[PDB]
Design a protein around this ligand. Sequence first.
Ligand SMILES: [Cl-]
Ligand SMILES: [Cl-]
Ligand SMILES: [Cl-]
Ligand SMILES: [Cl-]
Ligand SMILES: [Cl-]
Ligand SMILES: [Cl-]
Ligand SMILES: [Cl-]
Ligand SMILES: [Cl-]
Ligand SMILES: [Cl-]
Ligand SMILES: [Cl-]
Ligand SMILES: [Cl-]
Ligand SMILES: [Cl-]
Ligand SMILES: [Cl-]
Ligand SMILES: [Cl-]
Ligand SMILES: [Cl-]
Ligand SMILES: [Cl-]
Ligand SMILES: [Cl-]
Ligand SMILES: [Cl-]
Ligand SMILES: [Cl-]
Ligand SMILES: [Cl-]
Ligand SMILES: [Cl-]
Ligand SMILES: [Cl-]
Ligand SMILES: [Cl-]
Ligand SMILES: [Cl-]
Ligand SMILES: [Cl-]
Ligand SMILES: [Cl-]
Ligand SMILES: [Cl-]
Ligand SMILES: [Cl-]
Ligand SMILES: [Cl-]
Ligand SMILES: [Cl-]
Ligand SMILES: [Fe+3]
Ligand SMILES: [Fe+3]
Ligand SMILES: [Fe+3]
Ligand SMILES: [Fe+3]
Ligand SMILES: [Fe+3]
Ligand SMILES: [Fe+3]
Ligand SMILES: [Fe+3]
Ligand SMILES: [Fe+3]
Ligand SMILES: [Fe+3]
Ligand SMILES: [Fe+3]
Ligand SMILES: [Fe+3]
Ligand SMILES: [Fe+3]
Ligand SMILES: [Fe+3]
Ligand SMILES: [Fe+3]
Ligand SMILES: [Fe+3]
Ligand SMILES: [Fe+3]
Ligand SMILES: [Fe+3]
Ligand SMILES: [Fe+3]
Ligand SMILES: [Fe+3]
Ligand SMILES: [Fe+3]
Ligand SMILES: [Fe+3]
Ligand SMILES: [Fe+3]
Ligand SMILES: [Fe+3]
Ligand SMILES: [Fe+3]
Ligand SMILES: [Fe+3]
Ligand SMILES: [Fe+3]
Ligand SMILES: [Fe+3]
Ligand SMILES: [Fe+3]
Ligand SMILES: [Fe+3]
Ligand SMILES: [Fe+3]
Ligand SMILES: [Fe+3]
Ligand SMILES: [Fe+3]
Ligand SMILES: [Fe+3]
Ligand SMILES: [Fe+3]
Ligand SMILES: [Fe+3]
Ligand SMILES: [Fe+3]
Ligand SMILES: [Mg+2]
Ligand SMILES: [Mg+2]
Ligand SMILES: [Mg+2]
Ligand SMILES: [Mg+2]
Ligand SMILES: [Mg+2]
Ligand SMILES: [Mg+2]
Lengths: 169, 169, 169, 169, 169, 169
Amino acid sequence: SNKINDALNQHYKLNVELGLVYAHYAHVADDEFDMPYLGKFIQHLSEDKLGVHKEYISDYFKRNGMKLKTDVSVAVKSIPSDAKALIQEVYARENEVRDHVKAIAKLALAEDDYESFYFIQWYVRDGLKDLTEVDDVVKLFNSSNDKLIIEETIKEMVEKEESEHEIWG
Amino acid sequence: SNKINDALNQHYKLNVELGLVYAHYAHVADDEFDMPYLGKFIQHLSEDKLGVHKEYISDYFKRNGMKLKTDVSVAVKSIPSDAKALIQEVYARENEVRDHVKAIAKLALAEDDYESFYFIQWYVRDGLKDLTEVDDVVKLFNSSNDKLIIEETIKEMVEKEESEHEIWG
Amino acid sequence: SNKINDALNQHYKLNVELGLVYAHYAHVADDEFDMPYLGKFIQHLSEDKLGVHKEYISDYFKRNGMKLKTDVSVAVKSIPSDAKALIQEVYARENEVRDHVKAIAKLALAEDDYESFYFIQWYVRDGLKDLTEVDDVVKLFNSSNDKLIIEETIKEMVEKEESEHEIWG
Amino acid sequence: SNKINDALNQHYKLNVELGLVYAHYAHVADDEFDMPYLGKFIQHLSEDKLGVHKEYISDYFKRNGMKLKTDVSVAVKSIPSDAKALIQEVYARENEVRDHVKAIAKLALAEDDYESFYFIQWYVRDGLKDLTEVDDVVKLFNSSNDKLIIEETIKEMVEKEESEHEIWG
Amino acid sequence: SNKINDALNQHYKLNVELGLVYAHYAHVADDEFDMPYLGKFIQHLSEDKLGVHKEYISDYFKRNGMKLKTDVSVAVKSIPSDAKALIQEVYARENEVRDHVKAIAKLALAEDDYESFYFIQWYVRDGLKDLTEVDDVVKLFNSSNDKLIIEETIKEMVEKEESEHEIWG
Amino acid sequence: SNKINDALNQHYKLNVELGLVYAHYAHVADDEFDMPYLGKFIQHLSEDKLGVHKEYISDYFKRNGMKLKTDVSVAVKSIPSDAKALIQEVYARENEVRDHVKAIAKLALAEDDYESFYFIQWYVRDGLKDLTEVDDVVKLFNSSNDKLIIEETIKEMVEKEESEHEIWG
Ligand SMILES: [Cl-]
Ligand SMILES: [Cl-]
Ligand SMILES: [Cl-]
Ligand SMILES: [Cl-]
Ligand SMILES: [Cl-]
Ligand SMILES: [Cl-]
Ligand SMILES: [Cl-]
Ligand SMILES: [Cl-]
Ligand SMILES: [Cl-]
Ligand SMILES: [Cl-]
Ligand SMILES: [Cl-]
Ligand SMILES: [Cl-]
Ligand SMILES: [Cl-]
Ligand SMILES: [Cl-]
Ligand SMILES: [Cl-]
Ligand SMILES: [Cl-]
Ligand SMILES: [Cl-]
Ligand SMILES: [Cl-]
Ligand SMILES: [Cl-]
Ligand SMILES: [Cl-]
Ligand SMILES: [Cl-]
Ligand SMILES: [Cl-]
Ligand SMILES: [Cl-]
Ligand SMILES: [Cl-]
Ligand SMILES: [Cl-]
Ligand SMILES: [Cl-]
Ligand SMILES: [Cl-]
Ligand SMILES: [Cl-]
Ligand SMILES: [Cl-]
Ligand SMILES: [Cl-]
Ligand SMILES: [Fe+3]
Ligand SMILES: [Fe+3]
Ligand SMILES: [Fe+3]
Ligand SMILES: [Fe+3]
Ligand SMILES: [Fe+3]
Ligand SMILES: [Fe+3]
Ligand SMILES: [Fe+3]
Ligand SMILES: [Fe+3]
Ligand SMILES: [Fe+3]
Ligand SMILES: [Fe+3]
Ligand SMILES: [Fe+3]
Ligand SMILES: [Fe+3]
Ligand SMILES: [Fe+3]
Ligand SMILES: [Fe+3]
Ligand SMILES: [Fe+3]
Ligand SMILES: [Fe+3]
Ligand SMILES: [Fe+3]
Ligand SMILES: [Fe+3]
Ligand SMILES: [Fe+3]
Ligand SMILES: [Fe+3]
Ligand SMILES: [Fe+3]
Ligand SMILES: [Fe+3]
Ligand SMILES: [Fe+3]
Ligand SMILES: [Fe+3]
Ligand SMILES: [Fe+3]
Ligand SMILES: [Fe+3]
Ligand SMILES: [Fe+3]
Ligand SMILES: [Fe+3]
Ligand SMILES: [Fe+3]
Ligand SMILES: [Fe+3]
Ligand SMILES: [Fe+3]
Ligand SMILES: [Fe+3]
Ligand SMILES: [Fe+3]
Ligand SMILES: [Fe+3]
Ligand SMILES: [Fe+3]
Ligand SMILES: [Fe+3]
Ligand SMILES: [Mg+2]
Ligand SMILES: [Mg+2]
Ligand SMILES: [Mg+2]
Ligand SMILES: [Mg+2]
Ligand SMILES: [Mg+2]
Ligand SMILES: [Mg+2]
């Protein structure tokens, strides 16, 4: 499917640009908001988008004959005003990821592309996983007014040896 | 120095875009040229550019008050015709990296920015290191006409537990 | 160079007197401000100034024929009003350290004293390292109003098995 | 007792200035007299004066409400002519330490300050310990005319895993 | 830079010829002056000059396109009269090494050859290291008139598991 | 024997100059012929000539009263045209080594210098050993036209834990 090749190239592009924006947001979290642990959490998110998220698509393309396209433009011209808004912006991006992944799964079924529907199940699962982790961080800013209390809870999230849920892990 | 902040933001941008181009080149090396080990070598190069190469600058900026800028545009519209030309293109990019790094070191001395001159020594050293590794791969294509013989030599380069030279490591 | 011998004797004197002031500030942090961990952080800073910071210069002088001078006068006649101001005063001293080190590196190049320029690279690097650690402590007082929350974060900074950055470590 | 607070602040000052003079003497022992082991012995003495000797007083002050004062002036304007005289000068300083400590113990009893008399017992003991170690080094210069023979004996003193006397250790 | 290529080929030649002279001096130290440990110390110096000192330049040349030249002439026609003069001659050669290295660092900056300035920092550091070790041996001959006492001290220097100084190591 | 002293000083000179030429040839093998493993094989040969080959003679001279002479002149003005010719030139030098060693053994018997005949047996044995290793490398260039196939076989020769023949080892 050229439709599937296109939607998956779009998703590759979305994960690259997300990764670069999060790298910037990670820098701002520490450097401007004095929240280094919030920065590491977002930095880890950035390396996931620029890592397996994009690399699994290129690996898939090499298996099935689809064409990879690298066409990337992103610029960070405005920054959220504080840390809560920063992680709220992260949340909004991840929510849009779940929607685009939903379109790809729907399209693979429309095309009877059962290899692509299999492949996208990983991204269906991770769409909810990543959103859960970010939402666990959003809740902190409404559970405490002390930025060092929040930082301590993020520290444990980031340093947790993360044992993986039977379904969503 | 705003000059130094600018040159270093330029270098951050160069390492991001290099990283993305190499990720594409890595895919093409395996998928089009049937050279998976050439792909892993270039993939490792890609993750270095998108990893410590960019992250050390953002770390530096957070230490010294310089501003980070994320403004990235790159698109891979043409691909080299064969594997030799691919790694020759990689070589040319790395050679231009050494020139830009040279300008930054010269500028830091002009500015009496001895912290920036210290910081850039890492990139002066890695400029020659990375170029050496790529040149060791370029030489292979003129030492053999058998693409599987070359692949075997790249395999050992990539899988080498790389012990680091006292000066250039 | 007598210029270099003089600037380095000045720096030796600055590190001695800094060390003694920080020893006093460490005492005041616990004894007056009830922040024992802030005290240990500043005490560790004090022992670095009176330790390798001064001892590396005397070691250098013994290698190259320069004369060591011990001429030290310092008295702590006024104390900052609270803990935030205390660590802000520490910060200001460290910022002045970076400036004096910059003058020495500039002077060594002016003199073509490449041994002294090599020697001072350590102090160029540590100038930014020490300032980073102190600034990580300054930020705490504006991230929380609870002095025991701050103390807990300083406790982890001090007790961290500090793995050292590839460039600034 | 303000008398005790004063005498102990005086002793703090004496240990700081002693420490700095010994650091200079350690440098001169190696650099001028070619006796690096004599230097390490004196350097170790210097770090004891600037270490537990001063830090125990500041720790005591924080426990009992006494005020710490940092008022330090010392300059090394003349150097002994040879190594024997150097360690003889060290000896004379340590002998004066024992006298000042004796005055403090006598004063604490006069004041019925039994906490201060307890505290000073450490310094009564170390006064004789330190003097013994220095005197063991003074004797060497009258037991041999060969500076390398002396250096070898000091080397073992410094490198001895020093097991501590039941009373004076 | 052809200037840099030339100065570095000159330095390669200097290290080769130094190495061969020290090999002769090592032989004379044992065979004529009955100082086998002085011989091993000088022999170790010889193998450093003919080892990493020359090999790092050839390694550098292979990285950057500079030409290696092997043009070597040296003959040992006169021998110092005794051991003190022998190690004094060694000292004089090492002092001239520091001067030639200084010229190369100055030249690399003049040329904006920041790779060559990086490369030469190793030789700036080792220039002072090697001179320190030799000077520690020169001092022995003026600290004792007994050639076996001196030999014992050199023995420990040579057999020392040499832990390396943070700056000069 | 002055004859033996002379022939052995000649051999010392031959091993020094051979060592320096091989160091150059090792550089050229990698840098010009893209054969780094050929370079390491020749580099190892170079360090043997400048190592035990010369050092055993100086050790012998110190035992028996013979005079050591260091008189060395060598310059590499022409380089072989390709790798095969390079290792063929190495072979020719080693073959001449066997002839000079033969003259020394013959001379020691003529002189009834049975200590020198004993000493030279090592060099009689190593003369054939070294020639065998080099000849095993010469044969490769006539067994394959692929320079990377040859390099792989040299790699194993160099990395072989070389267990030593009962006679020639
Ligand atoms: Cl834009
Ligand atoms: Cl934006
Ligand atoms: Cl904030
Ligand atoms: Cl659809
Ligand atoms: Cl899955
Ligand atoms: Cl475009
Ligand atoms: Cl393109
Ligand atoms: Cl191809
Ligand atoms: Cl410039
Ligand atoms: Cl580095
Ligand atoms: Cl005053
Ligand atoms: Cl003050
Ligand atoms: Cl406070
Ligand atoms: Cl200046
Ligand atoms: Cl450093
Ligand atoms: Cl004065
Ligand atoms: Cl004085
Ligand atoms: Cl003396
Ligand atoms: Cl009294
Ligand atoms: Cl006690
Ligand atoms: Cl001559
Ligand atoms: Cl001569
Ligand atoms: Cl002698
Ligand atoms: Cl110049
Ligand atoms: Cl170094
Ligand atoms: Cl010639
Ligand atoms: Cl020739
Ligand atoms: Cl060839
Ligand atoms: Cl004969
Ligand atoms: Cl044998
Ligand atoms: Fe397609
Ligand atoms: Fe970051
Ligand atoms: Fe994760
Ligand atoms: Fe394809
Ligand atoms: Fe808000
Ligand atoms: Fe994920
Ligand atoms: Fe700026
Ligand atoms: Fe890939
Ligand atoms: Fe790498
Ligand atoms: Fe900033
Ligand atoms: Fe081609
Ligand atoms: Fe790199
Ligand atoms: Fe001076
Ligand atoms: Fe304290
Ligand atoms: Fe520290
Ligand atoms: Fe001096
Ligand atoms: Fe305040
Ligand atoms: Fe420090
Ligand atoms: Fe009081
Ligand atoms: Fe010292
Ligand atoms: Fe002690
Ligand atoms: Fe108090
Ligand atoms: Fe005297
Ligand atoms: Fe003591
Ligand atoms: Fe050249
Ligand atoms: Fe020898
Ligand atoms: Fe050494
Ligand atoms: Fe070349
Ligand atoms: Fe003499
Ligand atoms: Fe060295
Ligand atoms: Fe003879
Ligand atoms: Fe080499
Ligand atoms: Fe061998
Ligand atoms: Fe002799
Ligand atoms: Fe040929
Ligand atoms: Fe051999
Ligand atoms: Mg259907
Ligand atoms: Mg200038
Ligand atoms: Mg100048
Ligand atoms: Mg009474
Ligand atoms: Mg200039
Ligand atoms: Mg006969």
